[PDB]
């Protein structure tokens, strides 16, 4: 594009989440503009049993974003 550096802000780690009446999770939304630069996709939690890091930024963020309790 312009610079041959590693790669600037490469997406985030969880852009949204869908809970259930149980107040628990069920599905998550992951954005990625740097990659395709168009449209995001959804993936369930159980698959994020390897995105420990990604899930990590999210949790740390779960507090800030919205901010309630769940």
Q: How many CB atoms lie within 10 A of CB 15?
A: 15
Residue 48 has φ and ψ, to the nearest 5°, of -80, 30
- Taking CA atoms, 62 is separated from 8, 38, 42, 67, in Å, by 23, 25, 18, 7
CATH number, domain containing residue 18: 2.40.50.40
Q: How many CB atoms lie within 10 A of CB 58?
A: 20
Q: How many domains does the chain have?
A: 1
What domain range is 24 assigned to? Answer: 1-70
3-state secondary structure of 48: helix
Per-residue 3-state assignment (H helix, E strand, C coil) for 52-66: HHHHHHHHHHHCCCC
Solving technique: NMR
- Taking CA atoms, 7 is separated from 42, 47, 52, 66, in Å, by 23, 25, 21, 29
């Amino acid at each position: 594009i312009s610079s041959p550096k590693q790669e600037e802000y490469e997406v985030e780690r969880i852009v949204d989440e869908k809970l259930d009446r149980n107040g628990a999770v069920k599905l998550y939304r992951i954005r990625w503009l740097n990659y395709s630069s168009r449209s995001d996709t959804w993936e369930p939690p159980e698959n994020l049993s390897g995105c420990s890091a990604v899930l990590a930024e999210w949790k740390r963020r779960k507090r800030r974003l919205k901010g309630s309790n769940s």
